């Protein structure tokens, strides 16, 4: 019976359906709330829910030649944690 | 190394005391068993097509020709609630069986020894792992070796000095622009090229990308003295 | 690796938009709640299986513009930037070999086909350029003619065999990839393991629809037929035979789906283990990354699965 969110000017058409009450941007961030088909949702700043395309990480190209090598000079020691029932 | 190891366990003591989102796998085990037992005791209030939901309500009001009809709708409706609970607990026991065998495999490989498998006892080159206790679970602390700082160099696959090709025994060749050295692949230690670090095999008219250099002989100052 | 997702309405499958049927469904307890809770946990778990296998690294690498790999031709596994679908040539052949309104619906997956192929192109650029160092720390550049000198030493072979026979191993490597393009395109029975997932899940959906024509001892199989011919003193008896008949059909579909969801979960953990022991490094286990002495592996994309490519000695 609720039709308070059908005012308009926020409608964006996705592949899983349509998302109303949220704005669409053109940037790409790491999302936490999944929607479907790559579209995500978050809370970014006077703050509103935005929707964007899920990114896959920062770009990092590497050099490659016939006479190029990379040897490390220093190291760190790190301790992680794993929990299994 | 001992200063980086003692400062690494201190970063686990503040992460485990600030938030409780790290134990999310153990929280879903207790919450699923508490939700299955709560739903089973809530189905005793249903009717399943009978006149009442209390066995004393039907027995103390109706006649034994009719009392066998309404009780039959209650035994059939309650037997299907137990068959769903037992079957769901039998599938959940298969998930906890796959996690118990994985915890026993990491106890024998990562804890009681050293594994050479990539991304099994931690991210990186595994060195040590200490076990800890947990309610209905186990917690591992993987000590790993990770390189941090890098530096570019100019390499070559082999060298030849007097017609005979020289291959490196342990490591690769590097060059800072002037001379050539032999270093390892995980740490940079420049050493001079000698006969104890090389390996002679054939001539240098076959290997592509070979450069010209000199190989030091350790029998030069001792035989002249 | 994964399985397609589904969602079944509890009230729409039993009651055909009728209020007289839904008044009797509330006396059976929370049977409509447990069916939607079990199908929710399956659809979440199918999205987790594609993250432990493909999303192993979080740094997207790229191919260098100069293709100088020392006589090795990787022109069949690298993606094509000119095509609108960013896939390789072997990934295009693997896609063409695999083939309602009653409350049932199919939810789309989160990770689409273009984001899976970018994971494969990032892992292919790390194995060729960096090698076995992009899984333990940062990326270190090693030439491809010097990478196999360490891979030969891992199986007990000296580096004199590789360097003095570079024209023979590079010719056998390019001739081996070209044999896969003739073996897959001719025989279509090699992808029978992926077609057994979409066929056994389609038989369970057609069984729920064809079971709506059963009577279960009632007069007819239409809910509007019984409410139009009989009186509500007597109409509730025939609805009771149709509710209990359709409730055992929904409990059968969820229980058979929960057993099949455990084997895909058991197969996704095996694919996540081979994506780090055979691809990100060189393994020494016999009959794990192929028959013989394993050297390297290359991953490929596939619908509802993964396809490996081992290189042995």
Numbering used by the authors:
A (entry chain A): 632 to 676, 689 to 728
B (entry chain A): 923 to 1147
C (entry chain B): 729 to 827, 854 to 1067
Study text:
The spike (S) protein of SARS-CoV-2 is a glycoprotein that forms trimers protruding from the virion surface and mediates viral entry into cells. The S trimer uses its receptor-binding domain (RBD) to bind with the host-cell receptor ACE2, followed by a substantial structural rearrangement to fuse the viral membrane with the host-cell membrane. The Delta variant harbors multiple mutations in S protein, including two substitutions (L452R and T478K) in the RBD, the D614G substitution, a cluster of mutations in the N-terminal domain (NTD), and two more substitutions near the furin cleavage site and in the heptad repeat 1 (HR1). Here we present cryo-EM structures revealing two conformational states of Delta spike and S/ACE2 complex in four states.
To visualize the impact of the substitutions on the spike conformation, we prepared a prefusion-stabilized trimeric S protein of SARS-CoV-2 Delta variant and determined two cryo-EM structures of the Delta variant S trimer. The two cryo-EM maps, including a one RBD-up open conformation (termed Delta S-open) and a transition state (termed Delta S-transition), were obtained at 3.1- and 3.4-Å-resolution, respectively. The population distribution of the Delta S-open and S-transition is about 75.3% and 24.7%, respectively, displaying a considerable population distribution shift to the open state than that of our Kappa and Beta S structures (both around 50–50% open-transition ratio). There is no linoleic acid (termed LA) in the Delta S-open and S-transition maps, as in our recent Kappa and Beta S structures, obtained in the same construction and purification condition. In addition, in our Delta S-transition structure, the three protomers appear asymmetric, and the 630 loops and FPs are partially or fully disordered, which is usually the case in the transition or open state of WT/G641/Delta spike. Collectively, these features suggest that the S-transition is not in the closed state, instead, it may represent an open initiation transition state with its RBD-1 in the initial stage of lifting up. Compared to the recent study on the full-length membrane embedded Delta spike, our S-open appears more comparable to their S-open-2 state, and our Delta S-transition is more untwisted/open (up to 6.5°) with the RBD-1 tilted upwards slightly than that of their Delta S-closed state.
